[PDB]
């Protein structure tokens, strides 16, 4: 019985933390405005 270093099978560390209603989302250039944001701002470079 000296073999006590037998690591657990199936990586089951059940989620003690709260759930995540939000998953990662890459910020997209297509839904980011730019362009007309500075055209409706009278920038005058």
């Amino acid at each position: 019985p000296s073999a006590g270093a037998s690591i657990q099978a199936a990586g089951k560390e059940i989620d003690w933390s709260e759930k995540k209603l939000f998953r990662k989302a890459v910020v997209s250039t297509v839904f980011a405005s730019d362009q007309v944001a500075e055209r409706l701002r009278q920038d005058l470079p």
Partner: protein, 426 residues
């Protein structure tokens, strides 16, 4: 005081809603941490129109972001100005509304409408009195035409005394995104005409033509369309939040611009718009802003207003300006091309001035009109609908969720006699 509940729905609805809070927060000095960096009383003297203080100096918005699919909630929250809303108001489904009106209005939206209605009555019954709701759904697709219009019937019968404005995005059949657009459009007109009082039709062909021909941008994206729409969105409710000489709430737009209670689909266009070069050559004054808003390559509907007539109109002038030039310029347009302005209404339009201009600008106009050229919108989608319904095209889904053959014939009828009610006032 008077609060405007914002009832974003669908992928198009939440994306234009996020940019709407991106153009209202920068006017109100709001950081996306709820704080206020600014030095004017004028930004918080009426902060209760769109923002609610929650016990920590944070002005969380009144926005009820919904859909039936778990994707575009994540894009908004992780996006810019995203960590400003309330996650309880991020009410969503888990399945996918696959451009199907039947399972957005009748079956799948039925088990989510009760939870969304709880959220909207949460932030609407606790106030002094609400001025009115504000939906920004899209009238093409599954949950925009579905879940978006389903609540419109439910909260109309719950509050049948208040203004209900809808920045609906009509489908573009010239070049489109789906095939079942005619079904998702005709089955949403007949309940947007009986349970709504200010529709604001927005086409994507206009959003693409006027960003490229007027603004002279080679490739401006979806968020660029969102900022163009949301610029008009802020300019309709400018007078509610910011003070002005001739103020105008949403009900003031309705009382002056609705000839008959069924004729309430409105054109809308924001009309200072110069290109990258012409920002230093154009002259910002009231006559030049007046000429732009009647010019058809400023219009955000892509139904040409000079093919029809003008029952009535309006222009929310926004900025410091002299008020004679507000109203003497409007008979310059009413007397020059009087072939459009109809004869059974003298001085067809409603002017208004809110003193605070939008950010960066000095003077802006938000032209809203009721022209009988939107009957061309209901004409080209009628062409799409009668070609498909005559051959029972794409039907087994819709008859699959229980809704049957009969209500197409009054969906066509409610749109056809709406065209006939625009023929006999031009």
């Amino acid at each position: 005081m008077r609060e405007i509940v914002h009832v974003q729905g669908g992928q198009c609805g939440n994306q234009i809603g996020a940019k709407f809070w991106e153009v209202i927060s920068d006017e109100h000095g709001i950081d996306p941490t709820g704080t206020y960096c600014g030095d004017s009383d004028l930004q918080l003297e009426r902060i209760n129109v769109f923002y609610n203080e929650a016990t920590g100096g944070r002005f969380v918005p009144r926005a009820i972001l919904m859909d039936l699919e778990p994707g575009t909630m994540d894009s908004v929250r992780a996006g810019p100005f995203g960590q400003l809303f309330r996650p309880d108001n991020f009410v969503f489904g888990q399945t996918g509304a696959g451009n199907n009106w039947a399972k957005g209005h009748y079956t799948e939206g039925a088990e989510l409408i009760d939870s969304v209605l709880d959220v909207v009555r949460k932030e609407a019954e606790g106030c002094d009195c609400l001025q009115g709701f504000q939906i920004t759904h899209s009238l093409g697709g599954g949950t925009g035409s579905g879940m978006g219009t389903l609540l419109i019937s439910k909260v109309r019968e719950e509050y049948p005394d208040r203004i209900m404005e809808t920045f609906s995005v009509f489908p573009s059949p010239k070049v489109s995104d789906t095939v079942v657009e005619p079904y998702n459009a005709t089955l949403s007109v007949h309940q947007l005409v009986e349970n709504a009082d200010e529709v604001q039709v927005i086409d994507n062909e206009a959003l693409y033509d006027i960003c490229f021909r007027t603004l002279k941008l080679t490739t401006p994206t979806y968020g660029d369309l969102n900022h163009l729409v949301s610029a008009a969105m802020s300019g309709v409710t400018c007078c509610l939040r910011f003070p002005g000489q001739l103020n105008s709430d949403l009900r003031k737009l309705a009382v002056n611009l609705i000839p008959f209670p069924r004729l309430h689909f409105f054109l809308i266009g924001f009309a200072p718009l110069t290109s990258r070069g012409s920002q230093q050559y154009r002259a910002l004054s009231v006559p030049e802003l007046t000429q732009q808003m009647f010019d058809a390559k400023n219009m955000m509907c892509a139904s040409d207003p000079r093919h029809g007539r003008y029952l009535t109109a309006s222009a929310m002038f926004r900025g410091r300006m002299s008020t004679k030039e507000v109203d003497e310029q409007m008979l310059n347009v009413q007397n020059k091309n009087s072939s459009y302005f109809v004869e059974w209404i003298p001085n067809n339009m409603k002017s208004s001035v809110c003193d605070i201009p939008p950010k960066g600008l000095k003077m802006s106009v938000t032209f809203v009109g009721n022209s009988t050229a939107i009957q061309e919108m209901f004409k080209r989608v009628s062409d799409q609908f009668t070609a498909m319904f005559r051959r029972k095209a794409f039907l087994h889904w819709y008859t699959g969720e229980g809704m049957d053959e009969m209500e197409f014939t009054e969906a066509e009828s409610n749109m056809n006699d709406l065209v006939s009610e625009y023929q006999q006032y031009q």
